């Protein structure tokens, strides 16, 4: 099965920052992380530290100070199909998928509010909730 965009966006971003400290610094200010997936936040931390010590673009030396449990992931990403020169729009696109992922998750709170209304036959409430959710969805895509 194919991975969701936000996840691909995190992986690709990681794949790039592992080979470019120029990109690693941009992601540090723009994204915490703030990465959505734990393992990705974990790698992020280890990638950030790599420059905040001195070390430059070298995926060889990185996969050796990483706590072994993450190694398999860093290994996988360092082989992912990437042209090592990210475009201006690409970062905006990737970062945007990561930054408003939590926002898509906010929807599911209202999705339950809606279905519960629906269960107790409070339909106009349920519709109103759905009407709000469409606005929130437009706000993101």
């Amino acid at each position: 099965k194919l991975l969701p965009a936000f996840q691909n966006a995190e992986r690709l971003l990681l794949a790039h920052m592992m080979r470019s400290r120029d990109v690693a610094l941009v992601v540090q200010e723009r994204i915490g992380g703030r990465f959505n997936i734990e393992e990705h936040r974990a790698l992020a931390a280890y990638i950030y530290a790599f420059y905040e010590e001195g070390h430059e673009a070298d995926p060889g030396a990185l996969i050796s100070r990483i706590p072994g449990e993450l190694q398999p992931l860093a290994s996988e990403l360092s082989l992912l199909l990437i042209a090592d020169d990210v475009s201006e729009q690409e970062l905006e696109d990737y970062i945007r998928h990561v930054l408003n992922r939590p926002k898509w998750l906010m929807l599911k709170v209202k999705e339950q509010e809606k279905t519960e209304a629906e269960r107790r036959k409070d339909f106009l409430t349920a519709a109103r909730i759905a009407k709000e959710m469409i606005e929130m969805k437009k706000m993101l895509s």
């Binding site: 209304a117 339909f123 519709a127």
Partner: peptide, 20 residues
Amino acid sequence: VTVTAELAASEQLEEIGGVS
């Protein structure tokens, strides 16, 4: 909202799958 209301009044909401 108004389509939901309309279908509820014509007793067709559940039949068409509800607000969901």
